[PDB]
Symmetry: D2
Subunit: 446 residues, 4 copies
């Protein structure tokens, strides 16, 4: 039984560690092709299952109602390259590594999503995946000139239909439809390419898709949303789920809940892979590791962290002074309208203690609050990865990068070989497609 590894980072300035761009070792090459080529080549060298890019469609604005924090201090989405271009770039220099990107159902039509991913799936010869997102953020909508509004759970119901339409399009070409019979003059079999004529409540798309199926049949569906409604959506469609849990117990709880939602939807739980995020910080000795972690966290500016904390909680904390104790906010708002995640992070952050807004933002900025920072030698990190895996924490891990590209080099050079030697991680790619890497079946047409 073998675990899976995935890479994950913003095509831009910041992922989870909000002081990353400040690290002495950060090249900040996020505007260059070579930076992405290098990361992709490195993860492939480490035989990673996949490298996956999140996406945000606006510079983070909520905190301050202006760009002062986001642009000035390097906040979420300050720089965010269009993800599909980036992964096409990475596909061009790799041949096994799986590649995925977030694309929103909210701002793009089903035909676009269908065709862009079928295209990437063919260009990469079956290595592509799509992270389905359904969010509606104000700054994003204003970038797309959207004015309408749909309730959280309704957006998911709409996404159900979106997925149906996309899957229909992906099946519009039989796997034996393309003929290229030069002599006969038969390009394809028109009986094997069908219109889709999808016309549901939310969406209308005629088809057929202009792109045949890759050798993996269809792109792998990835899902990250862990809301009650999201978990349901995941159980139905998701082939791999990305989760963030601060410790083993929650990891295990999240794991079993996801697997259950999948069984509930009528699907094989073992056909949905569950990854959990960790942020390793290596050192030749444990002491060096801890020292390096301390340095990394010290780079976090309290306000960038607060800015991200605002976005994630929905609460605009720029309204309050930074020295505002969390108490005064509880009382100013009432423990009934204060998002649970906030109260959760708060309790765990200072350990029941009472923190200033500045101090909570600073800590949230280190690891987006809940991503475990593991500091140790490569042997320890490997031991922890293995011990968590055997304990049912997850089927694989998302390695959240402390700084780029350096941390991935260190992880691939130092940790992957220990995992391989222990027999818990591939020494070589067995198949050629992302589905083969994750152990997923080849979906059939229809």
């Amino acid at each position: 039984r073998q675990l899976h590894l995935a890479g994950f980072f913003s095509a831009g300035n910041v992922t989870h560690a909000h002081g990353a761009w400040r690290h002495v070792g950060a090249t900040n090459g996020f505007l260059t092709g070579e930076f992405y080529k290098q990361i992709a080549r490195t993860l492939e060298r480490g035989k990673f299952d996949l490298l996956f890019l999140p996406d945000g469609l606006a510079i983070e604005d909520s905190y301050g109602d202006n760009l002062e924090t986001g642009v000035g201090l390097g906040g979420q989405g300050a720089v965010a390259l269009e993800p599909t271009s980036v992964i096409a770039t990475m596909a061009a220099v790799t041949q096994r590594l799986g590649l995925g990107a977030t694309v929103s159902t909210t701002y793009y039509p089903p035909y676009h999503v269908a065709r862009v991913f079928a295209t990437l799936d063919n260009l990469s010869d079956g290595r592509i995946s799509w992270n389905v997102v359904t969010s509606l953020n104000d700054s994003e909508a204003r970038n797309f000139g959207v004015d309408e509004h749909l309730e959280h759970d309704i957006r998911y119901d709409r996404a159900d239909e979106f997925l149906e339409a996309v899957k229909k399009l992906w099946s519009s070409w039989s796997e034996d439809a393309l003929l290229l019979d030069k002599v006969g003059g038969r390009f394809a079999d028109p009986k094997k390419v069908q219109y889709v004529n999808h016309r549901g409540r939310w969406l209308s798309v005629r088809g057929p898709l202009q792109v045949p199926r890759s050798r993996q049949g269809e792109p792998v569906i990835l899902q990250a949303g862990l809301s009650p409604r999201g978990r349901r959506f995941a159980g139905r469609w998701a082939e791999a789920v990305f989760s963030v849990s601060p410790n083993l117990d929650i990891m295990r709880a999240v794991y079993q809940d996801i697997k259950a939602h999948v069984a509930a939807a009528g699907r094989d739980p073992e056909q949905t892979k569950v990854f959990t995020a960790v942020m390793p910080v290596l050192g030749e000795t444990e002491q060096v590791a801890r020292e390096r972690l301390e340095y990394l966290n010290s780079l976090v500016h309290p306000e960038v962290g607060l800015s991200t904390l605002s976005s994630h909680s929905g609460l605009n904390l720029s309204k309050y002074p930074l020295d505002t104790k969390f108490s005064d906010i509880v009382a100013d708002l009432g423990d009934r309208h204060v998002p649970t995640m906030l109260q959760m992070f708060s309790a765990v952050a200072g350990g029941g203690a009472d923190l200033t807004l500045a101090e909570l933002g600073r800590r949230y900025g280190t690891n987006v609050g809940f991503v475990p920072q593991w500091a140790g030698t490569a042997e320890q990190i490997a031991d922890q990865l293995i011990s968590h895996f055997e304990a049912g924490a997850a089927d694989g891990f998302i390695i959240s990068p402390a700084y780029l590209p350096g941390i991935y080099e260190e992880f691939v050079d130092q940790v992957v070989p220990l995992l391989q030697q222990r027999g818990v991680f591939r020494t070589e790619y067995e198949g050629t497609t992302l589905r083969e890497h994750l152990g997923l079946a080849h979906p059939e047409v229809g």
Copy 2:
């Protein structure tokens, strides 16, 4: 005085030569990364200014109201990969060649177009261009769930505002905005990144763009629609224009007309480069060349040709029997109710003869009616390119490929060196960006 060269081909089964996919030398590798990498490398080897991909968002459908012709015989857009993904793939393995893709202002919003192109521009280090189209075809609209109409010329007025919006976005980061002051903790200067707040008759987009400017400042704007309104739009926005004229006389006419449009828009005519299409067929001897062109043209199926002829003329000719003569159609519609392009093609193609639909379609399918086929030795081809260039046919040539990838190998290996030896074409890239290749100024932030 040096000419420019560009390649142009569909990321799919067919471009101008409708028999291409049946050619004994066609690899039909259009679903694979290596096909596109190979071509990009080949044109970079030949020091080409750019290669750009048209786009079509549906399998052509009119002819027959079905897929039998498009899918069965390999008509326009039977296979059509999403072009930005493809050029990203190409940028990844090249370093000087300019790259361009068509994205429609009809189906995509300004923020999206701005971001994807700024992203590509950065990834390629300033070699990207955007071919602007504004068409609204029925079958494409059905793929996108669009039911709204907008008259041809109005789509251009809408396009004007789109271009304004996009250009503002590309100017939302000053070129000295990004700081990366790690010590100080200043990521970027918030006074040098600004909201766009575009709110027009047609469009709304807040900004700022989440991507700063590449080293060429802004992607190059390409234009290919040469209707009266297209000519005005080119005059106002185009930095490169792509045209099809069957001979020198008409090339000269179009060339002067485009340059006149640019000056009339208050711009410098020398800052808009005009490319004219030609479809070369080489042979070691002129006799071999002729035989090869004859072989190529013999591969066209009359009905694929006919279907493209219907699309381009606006008339669905499938309604008529294949053996119907043109007169029998010209009379059934009246000398008034017959598209100008159709009369012009009918006159040139038949040289006076009254042809069947079948025969017009077959002839149309060889060269989309008006792309000149130049069969000759390399010396003859180079002589003619130089001759037309000196005669003011164009600033450059778009080389339309009879079949791929082979025709580009031949042209780069055989013709380019002769242009280079005659001194009319670069022996090496002088600069690194597409703007420098084209001799275009680096725009200032607005």
Copy 3:
């Protein structure tokens, strides 16, 4: 039953076709890395077993006893890059294609040959082969300051010992010798890395070799000398043999003879692959191919053909006026003193005619006398390849290039797919090493 395919060309100005550099399509990129990278990627795209480079260590000097013909007209060895650097370059951009280079046992010691090939083997991850040569040419010898003159058959006796020593060197590391046990501090097992202590009549080399075994164990041995002694040598050592035969009768005879020498050396005939050389000229129609062959052959300058003929015949034909008739040369030396290959070539090239020297050199220069030129459509070339294979002409074919790089593009694009459709040639690489492509067993240590 599948046939094998190999490329073969000099890293320089000329291989078999002596007008190749003058061909309109010749890039003459033979001084550039890109030329070799392109060809290597192309043969790999066509799934060739192997690309192999000859070598010659002096500009061909005999004819006219100067550099006038060699340098002025582009004779054999005029430009000749060191082959191992070339294949290393090609190894860097390919993943499956086999690669081979000629290195002479005459001028280089076993230790050097063993180390360079083991290095290439490791760098290419098991794709390398060595073409063993034992020849002694006067101009080459003067470049290396060699005075000794070993007799033809004796050079092979030395080479027997040479091969023994190289093979010993390649066995100096067991395949499990290298440990890399970082924690225990154990680099390799010194019991499993052994001195060779070779001390024979011809050679001394202590060892051990400083390079462990690749995943294919040892580089593949290639042999191309078909003299009686050379055939005994091939029987003992060769794993692939390369031969030139003008027609099927001769091909079959050479095939049987080689396999018999192998059987007589106590080895398995099926473990020595025989490749025969063919020079295809493609056309869309057979008429096009024939005109292209005519054009190619018209490029040969009489005196460069004469030069190569002089070297191969051992007879300096520069003494004679170019208009001398062959019969007058026979008269000059007496029938008994005319080299047999020269008499035979004259009869065959002339079909009984009494040709001038010029005309004899011209025809010889088209194909070095005996490489069969096959002009036809792709279907015809494929038919003939299959037909000869079925008739027992060879286990595979060396495709001698009329001109580069273009001919290999045509061959791979046009002929290879037809061989694949017919089931006679791999559609994909089954293994990763050169031995796996050729169906050769991985040799064991000792």
Copy 4:
């Protein structure tokens, strides 16, 4: 005044840090193409002037006169790939980085050296250099079957003629000799390609070379031998000199002496670039840096260190028990019979302490005695590089790698940008050739 940077490492298991292969971060990928491709791409990304590989032609044998120490523990030359193949591999994936290799005049003839470097120079488009070596090591000699024994200083006399011979060969083709006049049938001008006819006391080679000159005229000559004779040899021939000095006083003395030997030979001192070796060890903080250096030095096995100390000193220390004190060795042998470098090393490495052989070996193995280890922050290393440069220690630095590939990543990502920000190191390559990077002149033919 900008400084120059060079990488330097053995294509194998150990360079200067004898514990390097055991480092948690070492990939030990030295048998694979990707390892070398990664490092070349990294140094090119860092805009290095050059990467240079030393060579050894035998597994270090002296210590214990067996393979026990070298093979068992990973001593000098345990694994050593042939270096010309390795740099070809590297040249294939870079386009600016200079590349050099050690080839011995002792074991190879002028023609071979001249042709291999002219080939690499052409393949890399003028980026190559040759480190000239004249040493005679018993074990190397046994691998090449050499019995002859020339005195240290005479090998340098013979090397003088060798170099003469090589340069004549590199001048055998004028830079305008090659014509490629296809129409006219003129390949090259036979008047511009000349025989060499070198006949000297030591060597004979006729020529001409079969390789024209690259963009940079001739390969750059590198020299690293600093014996009195070697310094003279460097004065006459070297264009770049590589030197190991433990401190600023010595660096400056070496620098001035070399500059003076060049001027004494009639050459411009500014046309010979002096590089001095340093082994940086980086940390986020000086404290981390110091822990990392301590970790790295802790990996050295006393016997491997001793083995190299024995080879370099010329005194076989394996005869003595490891616990033997140095004073006891001097007493046993006589002060006249213990090499000076060895007594000097004992004195400096122990600071006056009387150390055992084991502890001497352990210390020597960290840095081959005299390569300065610099542990600090990126800012500190930049500072030291800059101040040593300004104090006249050298024209540039060789960065000796603590472990591979990781240390070059750290150095390029962390240190290079600070050097660039301070204006003492190029932000981009100005020219394309190695001669341009080093500020050297293009040599004139003849």
